[PDB]
Design a protein around this ligand. Structure first.
Ligand SMILES: *[C@@H]1O[C@H](CO)[C@@H](O)[C@H](O)[C@H]1NC(C)=O
Lengths: 48, 49
């Protein structure tokens, strides 16, 4: 029980400390935003 | 606040106009969005944005 409680404590500390731990989710949100922005930027193009 | 067709200086478009806190400096007359579409204009009869 003390090991389990201490290991759950280390999860809160880890998530409070680093930004990169959720990179697998932030990359999805970033690719959705980047793909929407690229589609808006192609309204600027002449295409000739 | 009503939707209209508009034409300022030959910039024909469609939309709703609004009094803007976007401070154009005196050399500018049109503002453009990320899409290369105008999103603000300085009226050619009352100098207001
Ligand atoms: C023309 O617009 C100006 C502002 O640029 C305004 O002061 C003036 O009253 C207008 N002209 C006439 C004939 O009213």
């Amino acid at each position: 029980a003390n090991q389990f409680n201490s290991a759950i404590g280390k999860i809160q500390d880890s998530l409070s400390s680093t930004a990169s731990a959720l990179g697998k989710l932030q990359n999805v949100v970033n690719q959705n935003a980047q793909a929407l922005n690229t589609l808006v930027k192609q309204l600027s193009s002449n295409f000739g | 606040n009503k939707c209209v067709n508009f034409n300022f200086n030959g910039l024909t478009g469609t939309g709703v106009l609004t009094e803007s806190n976007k401070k154009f400096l005196p050399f500018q007359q049109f503002g453009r969005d990320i899409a290369d579409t105008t999103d603000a204009v300085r009226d050619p009869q009352t100098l207001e944005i």
